[PDB]
Each structure stands twice: as C-alpha cells, then as structure tokens.
Design a protein around this motif. Structure first.
Motif, mmCIF file in Angstrom:
data_model
loop_
_atom_site.group_PDB
_atom_site.id
_atom_site.type_symbol
_atom_site.label_atom_id
_atom_site.label_comp_id
_atom_site.label_asym_id
_atom_site.label_seq_id
_atom_site.Cartn_x
_atom_site.Cartn_y
_atom_site.Cartn_z
ATOM 1 N N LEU B 25 5.572 -11.112 6.190
ATOM 2 C CA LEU B 25 6.660 -10.489 5.448
ATOM 3 C C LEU B 25 6.136 -9.307 4.655
ATOM 4 N N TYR B 26 6.572 -8.107 5.037
ATOM 5 C CA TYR B 26 6.133 -6.860 4.411
ATOM 6 C C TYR B 26 7.016 -6.506 3.218
ATOM 7 N N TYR B 27 6.451 -6.663 2.016
ATOM 8 C CA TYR B 27 7.195 -6.465 0.771
ATOM 9 C C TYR B 27 6.946 -5.127 0.123
ATOM 10 N N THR B 28 8.053 -4.527 -0.302
ATOM 11 C CA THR B 28 8.083 -3.338 -1.140
ATOM 12 C C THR B 28 8.493 -3.759 -2.567
ATOM 13 N N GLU B 29 8.669 -2.802 -3.468
ATOM 14 C CA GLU B 29 9.137 -3.125 -4.821
ATOM 15 C C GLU B 29 10.477 -3.878 -4.808
ATOM 16 N N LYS F 35 -1.986 4.033 3.854
ATOM 17 C CA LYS F 35 -3.369 3.772 4.220
ATOM 18 C C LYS F 35 -3.786 2.384 3.765
ATOM 19 N N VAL F 36 -4.405 1.634 4.663
ATOM 20 C CA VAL F 36 -4.693 0.239 4.411
ATOM 21 C C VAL F 36 -6.191 0.036 4.158
ATOM 22 N N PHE F 37 -6.510 -0.622 3.047
ATOM 23 C CA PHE F 37 -7.906 -0.898 2.671
ATOM 24 C C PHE F 37 -8.215 -2.408 2.576
ATOM 25 N N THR F 68 -5.884 8.420 -4.032
ATOM 26 C CA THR F 68 -5.431 7.396 -4.988
ATOM 27 C C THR F 68 -6.402 6.209 -5.025
ATOM 28 N N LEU G 25 -5.120 -4.210 1.599
ATOM 29 C CA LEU G 25 -4.340 -3.564 0.535
ATOM 30 C C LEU G 25 -3.629 -2.300 1.039
ATOM 31 N N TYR G 26 -2.298 -2.314 1.030
ATOM 32 C CA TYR G 26 -1.514 -1.199 1.591
ATOM 33 C C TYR G 26 -1.177 -0.149 0.545
ATOM 34 N N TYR G 27 -1.830 1.003 0.670
ATOM 35 C CA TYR G 27 -1.716 2.092 -0.296
ATOM 36 C C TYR G 27 -0.816 3.208 0.174
ATOM 37 N N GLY G 31 -0.406 4.121 -5.217
ATOM 38 C CA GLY G 31 -1.138 2.846 -5.277
ATOM 39 C C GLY G 31 -0.608 1.814 -4.300
ATOM 40 N N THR G 33 1.796 -0.317 -2.813
ATOM 41 C CA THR G 33 3.259 -0.241 -2.793
ATOM 42 C C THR G 33 3.825 -1.135 -1.676
ATOM 43 N N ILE G 34 2.933 -1.562 -0.784
ATOM 44 C CA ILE G 34 3.246 -2.557 0.228
ATOM 45 C C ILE G 34 2.264 -3.721 0.115
ATOM 46 N N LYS G 35 2.817 -4.929 0.160
ATOM 47 C CA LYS G 35 2.055 -6.159 0.168
ATOM 48 C C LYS G 35 2.623 -7.130 1.201
ATOM 49 N N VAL G 36 1.743 -7.673 2.036
ATOM 50 C CA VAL G 36 2.131 -8.551 3.134
ATOM 51 C C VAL G 36 1.827 -10.007 2.804
ATOM 52 N N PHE G 37 2.865 -10.830 2.891
ATOM 53 C CA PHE G 37 2.773 -12.271 2.710
ATOM 54 C C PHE G 37 3.036 -12.998 4.032
ATOM 55 N N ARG G 61 -5.606 -8.357 -9.448
ATOM 56 C CA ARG G 61 -4.792 -7.184 -9.129
ATOM 57 C C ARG G 61 -3.339 -7.351 -9.518
ATOM 58 N N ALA G 64 3.767 -3.895 -7.923
ATOM 59 C CA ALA G 64 5.209 -4.112 -7.945
ATOM 60 C C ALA G 64 5.703 -5.094 -6.855
ATOM 61 N N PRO G 65 5.297 -4.896 -5.572
ATOM 62 C CA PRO G 65 5.669 -5.861 -4.525
ATOM 63 C C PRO G 65 5.167 -7.293 -4.727
ATOM 64 N N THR G 68 7.674 -9.020 -7.341
ATOM 65 C CA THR G 68 8.959 -9.190 -6.673
ATOM 66 C C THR G 68 8.991 -10.448 -5.798
ATOM 67 N N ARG G 69 7.928 -10.653 -5.026
ATOM 68 C CA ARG G 69 7.786 -11.824 -4.172
ATOM 69 C C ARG G 69 7.649 -13.126 -4.976
ATOM 70 N N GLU G 72 11.009 -14.036 -6.664
ATOM 71 C CA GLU G 72 11.910 -14.555 -5.645
ATOM 72 C C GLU G 72 11.546 -15.994 -5.251
#
Lengths: 162, 162, 149, 156, 151, 158, 161, 153
Positions: B25-29, F35-37, F68, G25-27, G31, G33-37, G61, G64-65, G68-69, G72
């Motif tokens: 599941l790809y989450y944004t703000e 970009k993924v790290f 960034t 870590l999705y930048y 910063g 702004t995307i996080k995968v669960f 760390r 924002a994402p 939110t998760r 929820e």
C-alpha cells in the motif's frame, strides 16, 4: 549467424512495458502517472545512438513520463497508443527505406510475435513468454527493467566490432 | 474435472489487494494515493471479456487509482466498501441470474473463504494463505501483482477450447 | 502455455549426460536413478516415443533395457532423421537438454526442456526448466508434468 | 496457521521415492543400500510425540521398509492413492484435519488437498509444492523427514 | 565477457570443490565424465589447462592431458611462474576456484570463475559463476560457455 | 594492505544510481521527481562521518529528491551533471593525495577515478571492469545498504 | 515458555522502518512523501486491537504518510522523530500502569536492544541484525514489508487460547 | 559486527550429521569431506579449539586422527555446552556453533558465532549470523574456516 544479423542492424525497435520496465504500472487518480525505468538502459540507449543505430519505440500504452523519458534520451521515433505493431513497423520500414534484415525488435508479449517473425534481429527479454522467446534469435539473461537493453547494446558493440 | 468446471464459467470475481497487486500500500500525506498494477493482468482481463467472462471486483479498499485502472479496462462491476463477501456474491448472482457453478472467485484472504466454498471455479494466488489455498481448485504459479490474473485467463482459454 | 505444447507431444528426445546422469563416475561401481526408470515407463505407457541424441558414445544398455527406441551416440541432422522417420512436425517433438549443442534443436521443437543446473544459455531456450538437477530424477518430473497437464 | 495444523496432527503418511531417497540406486559389479541416518531419528522423534507413521508408495522398496519396520513403522502400503488414504483414515478413526502427508509425486496431490498437514519436498514439481502448507529445505534423501519432525516439535 | 574469452589461452583450476564435491568414499574415486568432455573441448579450442592445488584425481588428469599440475602449497607465486613459463599476460589466463586462497590470483586473471556453492568472497571476484555445484560438471560448463561466446 | 589503505582514508566519494539505489529511475511528466533510498545507507553515511571521513558525491544525474536526501544526511560536496576533472577539484580543495581518497562506483565511467584512488570500492552488481579495479567489493548490491557495509568494514580495520 | 510470555501481554510496541516497511525511503523534492506498507499488517493490527492489546509505535524517522497510516489504523501511542527509546518506553509503561512483563517490542535496530532486554515479549524481524535477533524471543519468518506484524498477531492469537 | 564476532572467536562447536555429512548411510562405506579436513587444519592453525556435540562411530575416528578430541556423543546440548564453557574458561562471545537441528537453537542463541548450514530448517537459520553456501557434507566446515581467515585481516 547471430553476428551477421547484428552486423547488419541499422534500426532497433523497442517495446516498453516488460522490456524497459518490469511490467508494473504506477497509477494515481489520473492514470499511469509514474513510470519506472532502469539507469543502465539509458546508457545502453546512448551507446546504441553513438554507434549509428536509430532507436524506435512501439508501445500500446501512452504516458507523459514515458514521452518525457524518451525525449530526454533523444529518442526519435515514438509510437504510443496503438497495439497495431505490424502496421506501425511497416510505416517505420517505409519512411527509413529499410529492409526487414536491417531492423531489430526487442519484445515481451504476444503482441510482438508477428513483427519479430519478419525482423532480422528479434530479441526476447528473459521474462518474455515462450511464444516470443522461440521467435527470438537472442534472449537476454536480464529481465525487463533490470538493464535488459544495456545487455543488448553491449552484444551489439562486441559483434559490430568483431 | 477442471475442463468442465471452467466450461460452465460466465463470470469471474476478483479481489484487488494481493491478487491484482503484490499487497503493498503506497501512502501519501492523504492516504493510499498510488496503486501499482501489472501489465500482464490488463491483457488477461481483456482476454476474459473477449471470451464472454464478466469480471467483478469485491474489495474493502477503494482507491482513485483503482477506479481509473478498472474503468480503463472496462471492469464495470465493482463493489467496494466494508461488505461481507457473501452479501455481494448474492447481489451478483441475482443480477446476472447465475448459479454457483457459473461463477469463479480468485481469492487471497480468510474473508474470501465462504464465497470460494460456494463457487464452481475457486482460484487462489500462490501467496494466498493456506486456508484460502485449501479451498481452491486451482492455485496460481504466480503471486498477486506478478501476473496471476493473466495466468487464470490463459488457463481458462486453454480449458474452454478443449 | 505448457498445456498447449504438452497436448501436441508425441516424441521426446533426451541427452543422458547431465540429464539422466549427474556425470559422476565411481571407480567401476557407478550406477543410476530409479525415478527416471519410472518416468520412462510412464512416457511409454502414455504413447510417447522416446529418443536419445548423446554426444558421448558410452550405458546405452540401461536405456535399451528400459525400452528406449531411437538411440544416436557419438545435433540438427540427427534430429531431422527422427522427424522424417516418425513423420512428425516440430510442434509434436520435445527435447530435454543441458548442453549448448542442444540449443538449435531446442529452438525448433514444441516442448524444449532444460535441467535445473544447465547453463543459462540452454535454460532460456526452454519452455520448462526442471526443479531437479538431472541425475536427481528430471525425466520422472517431466513425465509427471506431462501426465498432469 | 501452521501451528493450528500441527496441533491437530495425529498421523503422518509419507512416500518413499523422492522423500526418503533421492532416487539413486548403487550397484557393485550387488546393491549398495542407502538410508539417511537423520530420517531414522526423525521417525523415532515423531513416535515419541504420539504421531502414527504410515507409508504409501507405488514402488515397493525392499531395503527401506525393512529399515522402516525395524524402526517401528507398521502401516505400510506398496504397489491407487486416495483409496488407501481412506483405509488408514477409517482404520485409525481420524478426520482429514488430523492427517499429514509428505509427497513428491503428482499422484499425492488429491490426497494432499484433503489432509490437514500436506508437506512437499524442496525439489518436487511446483504442482505438488503449491498444494503443501510446508516445503522442506532439504531434498529427498538428505533428511527431509527429520526436518518435518523438527518443525512439528518446534511448533508445539 | 565476450572480450575476455577471445584472449583466453590458459585456464587454471582447483581440483577439490571444483572437479569434485570434496567427498571421500572409504579406496573409491569419483570423477565427473562431463568434465572429461569439457577438457577435450578446451584442448580442441587451443586452451592450455593447468591446476594449482593445495590428489588422487592427478593420474586421471595427466591421462586426460593436463600439463601444469601443482599440489600442496596455498598460489600467486605458482601463478607467476605459469605466466613466465608460457609468456602469457593476465588477460590471457583464467582461473576456476571455490576457496579464498584463490582470490588474489583470480583478481589478476582475465577470466576468473567461481563455482555455484563457493564462498561469496570468491564469487564476488568472479566474472562468471557456474550453475553447476562442482563434481557436477562445472568444467564442462565453462568450456561450453567459452565456445558459445566465441562461435 | 587493505587495513593500510583504510587507515589513510579521509574522504569517500560516491556514485548514486546503482550504489545508493538499485538502478531504478522513477519518472513523472516533469522527469525524475521520485527517488528511492535505503535507511541502512543513511546509518552508514552518519557512521562514516563519525569516523572523520568527509563524504563526496559525483553523479552523472541531477535530481531534487537526491539533493534533499544528500543535504539531509549532511553530505556537502555534491557534484551532479558530471569525472576526473571533478576528482582533481576535490583533491585540491581538501589538499589530499590519491591514497587518502576512496571511491564507491558501479558504472564504467567510474574506472578512471577508481584507478587513481587509494580505496576503490565496487558494489556487488557493479560491472566486471569496475569490480576488477576495486580492492573491496560489497556483498550488498546497492540500494541494499552497501554504504552501511562499507562503514562496518572501515570501522573494523581502524 | 512462549505461551507464558504472550499470556501476560497487554501492550505491543513496534518499530516502523524494517518492521512495517522494507527499509526503503521514497523521496521527492520535500523529503519522504511516499511510504509503502503491507496490507497483511493492517489485518494484524485489527486483530491485536480485538484481542485488547494496546499498540505503540516508536520510530526514529518522521513522515506525513507515516502518521496518516498509523492514525487510520487507530494506533494509540505514536512516538516519532526520537531515537531515545528507553525514555519514551518509560513514558508508555507509566501511562498504562504496566510491568515490563506485560509489554512486547518488535524491533529492527540496534537502538531497540536496551528496550528489548527489559520487555516480556521481545520480537525481532527476520532482516534484523544479529545483535537484535539475539535479544529476541521470537524471530519472524517474514521481512519488514512482507506482513511481519500479521505473523506476530496470528502467533499471539494462537498462544493466547 | 560479523568481523567483530570472528575476532573474539576461540572455540568452534559443531554437529557431525548434517554439518559434516548429508546424513546418508551406505550399507552392505563411510563418507568424509576432504575440504572439511583442510578446514579443520586451518582452524587449528588459527588457535581455534574444535569441539563436537552429537547423539556415530565411523567419523569420530577420523576427527580424532585430525586433532579433534573434544568429542561428545549421546545427547539436549545446553548442559554439555556449559561444561565446554567451564573447561575452557570462555564467555558466550568467544564461542561459535555450527548447527543443523532445532535442539541447537538454545545454544546458538547464547554463542557469539552461530552458524547454520544451507539446508537447515528455517528456525535454525533464524538464529545464525552466517548461513553457509554448502549444504551438508559439501565442505561446510571449510567454508566457515575460510570466512574466519578472510575476515581476520
């Protein structure tokens, strides 16, 4: 016979999804908004253009990130939207005044089988179906999105100069 | 057996998460804004529609990217929200005047079990929990998002025409 | 898909070296696999003709003994001989290999098989790659996949 | 999930070929017998845990079976699977959920679909593997039965 | 890889873990017949064969035509005199190993090969890693790769 | 000799794609905007700095998300759009010798610098020509936490 | 005595990166702004909530994402932006009027070691460093982004009754 | 900190069956891995004491001939572990264990250098700092010995 097919190569046509990509489609609200490519394929593309090979794209899908990526790499000859690959192929032949034997194609899915059956350099990616791998003269060891195109470029570099 | 189960098939129901996706599941703000699919599944979906097999979706998670992907593929039968799977199953049955034996379900999680116990063609993805796998007549070679749905379309295509 | 190609299958060719055998010579107290013998029985009962195109002119006796029909020992010209003798198309023939000299015949046949530890070059020309290494019972695995499909 | 299946387990049926052996036969110009020492410990371990042991194989094997009978295995069927399964099931008055099966054959698949604890060997064909709740790290003949014994014991 | 293989004139190898799985059956010798076929292909191809080992497989190896056989050392000093002997460069030589003792020699050669089940340390310095485990026919595999990548 | 090379080190230069990334390039309409790290590399970056190693970046590619991420980790010497030319400018700025600098690379256009440098590192997936020049090759493929592994190695040898 | 430890469990603490995430870590320009669960982890949480076990998160760390998760998911105690885990572990323990034996911790990082040495139900994920797996009482089969929390939740449910 | 664990290592304990063998018994001949023999010699040259815990006759003779005398048979391994620890006056961090079995796990949890063989049950691979590339009796002991030697300096 592989070296001969390669030495005669003037134009390499590419599929996108499953070839320059791992087959994943990234969607937001307004469609395929993200496309993930491989860095090594970008060096391969520039290496192929440096060696005098025109690069073409026939992709059934259209995408703004794709067009952007293709334009950045200086790619040329772009067909997106239509799955009519054979009819598009024949447009490419006609405008570049090329024979079948001096054209290559790198494919992934059933859609590409009939183009690869005419083409002098038909290439199947590793993760391609049995149906296009049988029709291929070279099969990459790397899957689509893993630098499969970089691999084909390096094969072309060697055999052209051999 | 298996040949006859699939000859009776007029409609296939599918989950999304874990079946059309790898379960990520790809989450944004603002929540699940990105949804990743497989290009092979889009081809398999249109193949099933061409063969006369209606597609349905039952999934608790709704997403704007999901809506756009499904619409683009012509999947019009979509049931999202917090429903018990069996409740929806019977709405679908009534709507299309279909029996249990004329319906297929490709499941993933325990929430799918009672519907899969009823349908003529219950399918599980390779990654599906063993409770779902034991109830399945066919278990796919591919995990969800790897192209499991194209696999089920190809299998149906072979079995119907023989 | 596998099921389409297994459906046309009437004749299956094999290598012996690295397929029916791991290559190991014990010294001569050397000997071989029983799963493959049961795979051979299963193919012959399924009405599939069995052939062998081996590079080494060796243990043809074990094959003779198990009832193997065509035996060539010590390649495309040989493959074409079998095709005309049995009046078959490419689509009706299978080939289990592990050698680079097998590749060109494997590209032609409808059911090309590679063993697990075959070179990638051979494996990418195959429709099916076995889970067994060859010597480990690859031929049983093939015969049992054919029966199932 | 796995611990729930193991909990109900009271009988483990197994194959010979591909599970207790790698299929290889050895002949002195005579026969060299091959049995895995870890599988004998696995057999005793399973017995100590109150799990009845049974064998269903199409191929008979004189050297094993002799060993298995010496080790205490009595429920032995050689030479039609899912007829034989139903016989052992009724004989011991068990449910499907209470039986386990270790297989390396497509003939096992229909039985493995019924049983509570289906097990496939590492290098078994994918058709077999996708039906099992557990797939072993070891091949046939390298101590696969002992690994299953190890696992059941750890999950209790 | 197609470049490295063109220059190749000498191929050095370990015996144990490469031509064998290391097993000892006790007065029983095990040799892979596929490796015999690999040796002849390499000889047909004009490639000289050598071993640097740190023992019963020697008589079969010599009978199969293997020239340079060194046994009982633990390899750069022996590599260096093979180089001097045949007037070869690093780029013209290959090495097939499975041990960390091979690493320094493998770093110099043009075609370093590691076997499937070799230590990661050995594998990361290899240009090619075999699909065969060793004692399975890994020398046939290297022979047939060279042939393929050539012609 | 590796312990000796590590002991001289004062500045480590990095490539990005194929080193801190698995090679993937995430594109939107306006280019590479995602970009993924790897979190492990972030730890590695900090760990190397705590050992008194200046970190530098010479990448052929430019990206907002990259800078960034790099700025966030305190990487100062950032060179994007580019390699031997930039290498001398860094050597000159920090008054260093070849033997006092390190380089972790992946691509062929890194070779030139890697042959000059005292601690050349190749990531696991790196091209063979690059891997051959390297005195150390990571187990990790890059994007897999290669930098953390370089930090552990340097920590042990010092 | 894994049953004994779990039967005492009233609260479960967890890392994020390498436990609910694969460490990637999705930048973007601004910063992370995307996080995968993983969806399996969602059902895991609802299962622990049903069980009556309080869920805490302590992450180094912040994004924002991430918030939110976790919001929820209904996660009660969300600590983020801090690497001082003993300090806030002591906050959570105090707030809930609990003993060490009633708390569980699923860690990935070396920073977790000292909190995991106190807790009654210390858990490591598969990918965790040996220093952490060593301290743990359960090591998961699944890695960080693969439903490792689903695994722990099902485990707890089995050992409970 | 794998190089940290290796540096402290003074004593390596192993199982025989599954670690020095695949477990197969040839009946009418014994199977030893010669690479493990060389592996044994290298470990000795680096001041690492070798011990075995088993629960067997053919291979013990060979080990005894190669310099392995700390040999335990007929076992439940925690208590004999504490014995070896007492006898050699070592901490957990100075010891290594190459395991194959679920019984080994409690000892492997404690020791500084826990090793699993490639085809060990996952429960045992979980508690190892290193998983070997060799299966069984493929030369797994030598693989551990090479690693210790490489990771030295």
């Amino acid at each position: 016979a592989l070296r001969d097919r390669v030495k005669k190569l003037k134009l390499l046509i590419m599929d996108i999804d499953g070839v320059l990509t791992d087959g994943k489609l990234y969607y937001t609200e307004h469609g395929e908004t993200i496309k993930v490519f491989n860095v090594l394929d970008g060096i391969g593309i520039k290496l192929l253009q440096k060696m005098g090979i025109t690069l073409a794209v026939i992709s059934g899908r259209d995408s703004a990130p794709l067009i952007t990526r293709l334009k950045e790499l200086g790619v040329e000859e772009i067909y997106t939207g239509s799955y009519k690959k054979l009819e598009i192929y024949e447009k490419i032949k006609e405008k570049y005044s090329l024979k079948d034997e001096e054209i290559g194609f790198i494919g992934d899915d059933v859609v590409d089988i009939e183009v690869m059956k005419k083409v002098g350099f038909p290439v199947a990616v590793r993760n391609a179906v049995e149906e296009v791998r049988k029709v291929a003269v070279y099969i990459t060891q790397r899957n689509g999105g893993e630098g499969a195109l970089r691999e084909v470029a390096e094969l072309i570099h060697f055999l052209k100069n051999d």
